[PDB]
Amino acid sequence: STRKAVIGYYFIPTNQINNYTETDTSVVPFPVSNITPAKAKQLTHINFSFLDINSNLECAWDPATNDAKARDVVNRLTALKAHNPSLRIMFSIGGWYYSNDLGVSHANYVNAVKTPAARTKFAQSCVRIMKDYGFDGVDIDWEYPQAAEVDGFIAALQEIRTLLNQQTIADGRQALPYQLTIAGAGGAFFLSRYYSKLAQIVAPLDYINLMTYDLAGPWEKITNHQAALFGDAAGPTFYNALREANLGWSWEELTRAFPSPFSLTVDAAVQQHLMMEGVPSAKIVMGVPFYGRAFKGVSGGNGGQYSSHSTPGEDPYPNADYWLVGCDECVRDKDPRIASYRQLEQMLQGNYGYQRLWNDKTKTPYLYHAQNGLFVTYDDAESFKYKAKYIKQQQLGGVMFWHLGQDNRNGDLLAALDRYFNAADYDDSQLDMGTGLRYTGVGPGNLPIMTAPAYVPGTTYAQGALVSYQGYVWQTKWGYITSAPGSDSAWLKVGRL
């Protein structure tokens, strides 16, 4: 029954708002009018981005924003709701530029959530902005609160939730209640900052939208897929930072939940969330990229995968060599390292020297330019079949993507996602999910159903013996054990009845 969420970011920089126009793509490449009624029907949420937190510790527009122009842009988005009574226009606070550890507004994020009074003032500003501009909910994209700030962040979400609920009552919006989401880490290293308190983070949210992309980039030594669904044993692996989180678990519990090293994949991030007690699968949304990440200086042999590379990691892109052959948008944006799916289609179609290759373990496409040594990791309508099937099988809440302007003109990526979830005639029952590496971790939140003989008092159990007892299946960690399962540290809870 329940419709999967389809959450698309609409990003527009301040300069484009201030010069907003729907008839000049060299000024605004992707105006609201490109979101046609058909696209609007295929979305459940549009996340308008980005607002910020100012030094007054309130949610605010960038202060250079022309306010009349901003209201006009937002009004155009909310007018889309005429075509889809399920559709919400959220607004997002944060993003990497504003909120990263070294970002321009970082201290405002830290300070806004720091004390009860600050949280109240911040929470109020969020709901006030929401009402003033006509938004339908609040998305927080702070990348990322550090373990010490996590309790404040949690209390801030709780308080926003209460104020949103009041507003839903005041406006009689029970048919479309005001919502709260966050953009969550999609890889273990950032996730470990708040992982131990994941259940408290998710409780106040309608959805946690996993940034399950940007898992490879120029900061890594070796090229890799940025959003592999499953792992490739030929690919790099990473230290599992979650095993060092402050969980209070035992060695066996830690080891069973957090294999290490592990493959940095979409399935890993999803499973890591599901392992936590009190994190329901319906609130987890899988992010996907509508862009590819490009690398230069790559060697041959494996289509450019898992190769050293000479891609600058600095920001801004440090020179004017725009080496991603055929990428016109790269020239416009002065950066050959990111290419929209829209542009990648054109690069494939023109005489630019790319081959489209497919990794059947990761279930993702990549471009390889044999002559110049280039590699591009991206997603398309094919990789989205496997991802949508995974979303259905794991009973996730839906899909999120960055960003709407990166789909092709016909919006084929959005239309594919919508089709995989909702088309009566689409059938993926035979879609083969392949033999790529699954994240095998098990934690208190995802115990498999098991059976085993009932525990018998007085029996001496050898190491590895399985019994059932009080709702669960238990395994001895050593032998010989005679204690009742769960009464001391000799038994590992491994499954549920």
Ligand X SMILES: CNC(=O)NC(=N)NCCC[C@H](NC(=O)C[N-][N+]#N)C(=O)N(Cc1ccccc1)Cc1ccccc1
Q: How far is the CB of 210 from ligand X (least distance, A)?
A: 10
Which residue sits closest to ligand X, CB atoms considered? 96
Q: How far is the CB of 38 from ligand X (least distance, A)?
A: 24
Q: How far is the CB of 143 from ligand X (least distance, A)?
A: 6
The residue among 402 and 421 lying less far from ligand X, judged by its C-beta, is: 402
Among residues 143, 149, 159, 329, which one is catalytic?
143
Specify whether the CB–CB gap between 356 and 374 falls below 8 A.
Answer: no
Residue ranges of the binding site: 67-68, 94-97, 144, 211-214, 402
Specify whether the CB–CB gap between 265 and 231 falls below 8 A.
Answer: yes
The residue among 13 and 464 lying less far from ligand X, judged by its C-beta, is: 13
Residue ranges of the binding site for chitin: 67-68, 94-97, 144, 211-214, 402
Q: How far is the CB of 85 from ligand X (least distance, A)?
A: 25
Q: How far is the CB of 20 from ligand X (least distance, A)?
A: 21
Quick one: which of 272, 247, 244 has its CA closest to 186?
272
By CB under 6 A, name the binding residues for ligand X: 9, 95-97, 141, 143, 183, 211, 214, 217-218, 291, 313, 315, 335, 337-338, 402
Catalytic: 314? Answer: no
Q: How far is the CB of 95 from ligand X (least distance, A)?
A: 6
The residue among 377 and 446 lying less far from ligand X, judged by its C-beta, is: 377
Q: How far is the CB of 5 from ligand X (least distance, A)?
A: 15
How far is residue 79 from each of residues 33, 75, 84, 123, 128, measured CA to CA in Å? 11, 6, 10, 26, 20
Distance of alpha carbon 126 from alpha carbon 218, whole angstroms: 35
- Supply 380's token pair: 């398309």
The residue among 134 and 217 lying less far from ligand X, judged by its C-beta, is: 217
Query: Phi and psi for 386 in degrees, rounded to 5?
Result: -70, -40
Q: How far is the CB of 426 from ligand X (least distance, A)?
A: 27
- Three-state secondary structure string covering the chain: CCCCEEEEEEECCHHHHHCCCCCCCCCCCCCHHHCCHHHHHHCCEEEEEEEEECCCCCEECCCCCCHHHHHHHHHHHHHHHHHCCCCEEEEEEECHHHHCCCCCCHHHHHHHCCCHHHHHHHHHHHHHHHHHHCCCEEEEECCCCCHHHHHHHHHHHHHHHHHHHHHHHHCCCCCCCCEEEEEEECCHHHHCCCHHHHHHHHCCCCEEEEECCCCCCCCCCCCCCCCCCCECCCCCCECCHHHHCCCCCCHHHHHHHCCCCECCCHHHHHHHHHCCCCCCHHHEEEEEECEEEEECCCCCCCCCCCCCCCCCCCCCCCCCCCCCCCCHHHHHCCCCCEEEHHHHHHHHHCCCCCEEEEECCCCEEEEEECCCCEEEECCCCCHHHHHHHHHHHCCCCEEEEECHHHCCCCCHHHHHHHHHHHCCCCCCCCCCCCCCECCCCCCCCCCCECCCCECCCCCCECCCCEEEECCEEEEECCCCECCCCCCCCCEEEEEEC
The residue among 326 and 405 lying less far from ligand X, judged by its C-beta, is: 405
The residue among 212 and 307 lying less far from ligand X, judged by its C-beta, is: 212
The residue among 97 and 238 lying less far from ligand X, judged by its C-beta, is: 97
The residue among 204 and 218 lying less far from ligand X, judged by its C-beta, is: 218
User: What residues are labeled active site?
Assistant: 143
